[PDB]
From TrEMBL:
This is non-specific serine/threonine protein kinase. The chain holds residues 393 to 484 of 492 of the full protein.
Length: 92
């Protein structure tokens, strides 16, 4: 449940997501133009690392979040915090 479609194209979805995570204080590292590793330190000082993939799916951009390291529910909560911060680009 950590994925959603956007109302934007690949590079505007990549851009809106990047600043949202950078404003939230998450580290933003790129992989292959639509693959990004996001890192932060969650409540109680544990490292939280998850990856994002922006893929085109039927004339829409799907932003998928995959937990890489850290607590699962803190991942689910950090995803919901990101989704809320850019809820205006989230497609129905």
């Amino acid at each position: 449940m950590t994925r959603f479609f956007t109302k934007l194209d690949a590079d505007k979805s990549y851009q809106c997501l990047k600043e949202t995570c950078e404003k939230l204080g998450y580290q933003w590292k790129k992989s292959c133009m639509n693959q990004v590793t996001i890192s932060t330190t969650d409540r109680r000082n544990n490292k939280l690392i998850f990856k994002v993939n922006l893929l085109e799916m039927d004339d829409k951009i799907l932003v998928d979040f995959r937990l890489s390291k850290g607590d699962g529910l803190e991942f689910k909560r950090h995803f919901l915090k990101i989704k809320g911060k850019l809820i205006d680009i989230v497609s129905s």
